[PDB]
Subunit: 56 residues, 10 copies
Amino acid sequence: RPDFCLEPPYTGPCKARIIRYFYNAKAGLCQTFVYGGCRAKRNNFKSAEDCMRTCG
Amino acid sequence: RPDFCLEPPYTGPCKARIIRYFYNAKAGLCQTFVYGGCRAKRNNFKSAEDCMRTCG
Amino acid sequence: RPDFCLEPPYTGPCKARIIRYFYNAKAGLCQTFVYGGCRAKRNNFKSAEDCMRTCG
Amino acid sequence: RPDFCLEPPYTGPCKARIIRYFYNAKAGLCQTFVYGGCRAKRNNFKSAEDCMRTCG
Amino acid sequence: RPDFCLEPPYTGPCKARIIRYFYNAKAGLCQTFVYGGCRAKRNNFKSAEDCMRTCG
Amino acid sequence: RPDFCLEPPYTGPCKARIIRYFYNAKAGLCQTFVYGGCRAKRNNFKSAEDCMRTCG
Amino acid sequence: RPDFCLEPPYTGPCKARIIRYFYNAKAGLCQTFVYGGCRAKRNNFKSAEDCMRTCG
Amino acid sequence: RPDFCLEPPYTGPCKARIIRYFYNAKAGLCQTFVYGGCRAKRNNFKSAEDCMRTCG
Amino acid sequence: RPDFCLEPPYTGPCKARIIRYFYNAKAGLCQTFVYGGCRAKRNNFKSAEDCMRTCG
Amino acid sequence: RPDFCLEPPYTGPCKARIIRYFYNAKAGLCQTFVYGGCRAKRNNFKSAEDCMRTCG
C-alpha cells in the first residue's frame, strides 16, 4: 500500500463539515472523518470503495 | 441478528450533522439519527437497506 | 464479525445489473459484485462503509 | 399500516431494471424488487427509509 | 390516502438541517420542510416520488 | 399549470432506460416513465419535486 | 416559457442552506441560489436539467 | 464560450447507456444524450449545472 | 484550455458550505473548495470529471 | 504516484455497464471506462476526485 495511507486524517482550514474516508493503518480499515472542504491530503477518499482498494 | 444491533445510536465527538440509520430493537425497525462524522459504532448505517438486512 | 459475512456473494434470479458490496473473508475486505435486484442474502451491502463496519 | 402495504411487488410492463423497495408483510420488513419504470403500484418505494416508516 | 398524510410536518428535537417532503392536504401536493434528523413522524419522505404515491 | 404538462410522456429514439417523471393530468400527479436519453419533451423531469411544483 | 420563470429566486423563512436552481430571465440561463428548505416558489429546481427545459 | 461547446455530441465506441449533457449551440441550452462510457469529447458534462456555466 | 480555468476559486457572498471543484493551473489538476451557493464564477464545477475535461 | 496508476483499465468478466475512472498516465489525467462489476484492479475509481488525488 502507498505511504500516504499511513498519514493521519487532515480536516484542513476550511469551514465545511463533509464526510470523507481515510485509511486507519492500525485498525486495518477505512473510517470516516470530517473534511473542511479544501487543502486535502492524499489519505482522503470520497468513496469508501476507493479507500479500501487503494489502501487495503 | 448481530449483538451490535442492540446498542443505542452513537453520535460521537465530531461536529457534522449527517443522517445515519440505526436499528431500534424495541420498534423492530431502522430509524434515523444524527452522526457527528467520526468514531462510529457498529449500529450506524449509511443505507437504510443495509440496516434492515443486517439487523432485521 | 457476523457469520453471514462468510457467505459467498449471491447475485440472485433477477435481471438487473446493480453493483453491491460483499465481505471477502479471505481477502479481509469488501469487494464489488453484481446483484440481480431481488432475493438478496445478508452479505450484500449498498454502501461500502456499511460493509467494512459490519463485517470488518 | 396502510392496506397497500399488503400487496405483492409489481414490476410492470416497462423495460427498465431499477431497484425499488416493497413491504413484505410476512417477513415484517422491506425488501428489494425490480421495477420496470412505469405503472407503479403503491407498495413501491425509492427509499428504504420511506418503506419502513410508511409500512413498518 | 392514509391518515398520517393529514399531519403537519414535524422537524423534531435534533439539530440537522435535512430536506424532507410532507404531504400538504390543503394544497393537494407534497412540499419540502426541514427535518432535524431524529424522531420522525410518518408524514416525512426522503423521496418526493414516495410522497406523491403514498399520500396523493 | 403550463400547457406542456398535458402532453403524454415521450420516451424518444435513444436506447437508454432512464427513469423520469411526467405529469399525468388525468391522475392529478406525477408518475414515472422510461426516457431513452435524447430529444426530450417538456413534460420530462429528473426530479419528482420539480414535477409537482411545475405542473401540480 | 411559464410566467413563474420570471420571478426572482426566493430563499424562504427556513434555516437550511441547500443549493437550488432558478431561471435568470435576463441572463437567459439557470443559476444557483440558496434555498431555506420550505415555502418554495415555482422558480426553484432541484435539477438544472429541469430548469433549462422548463424555463429555457 | 469555448469552441468545444460547438461540437456535436459524441457517444463513443463503448457499450454503456449513460446520460450526459452537451451544449446545443443552436438551441442555446444544454440537452441530454447517451454516452457510451469511454473516449469522451469535451462537450460532455456529468452535471447540467457545469454545462450551462461552461458553455452558456 | 479556456481562460476562466486560470481564475482563483470564488466562494461568493452566500452562506452555504458546498464542495465544488476548480482547476488549479499551477498544480495542473482540479481541487476542492467551498462554494457559498450563489454568484458562481466559471471555474466552479459540481463534477470533478467535468473539471478535468473542461480545463485539463 | 503509485505503480498501479500505470495499469490499463480493466473491465473484468462481469456483465454490468458501470462508469469508473482510471488514470491515463500518457494523457496525465483521469478518464472514464466501463467496469463490469467484479474483479476490479487498483486503477479503478468510483470518484474522479479520488482518481486525481491518488494518481495525479
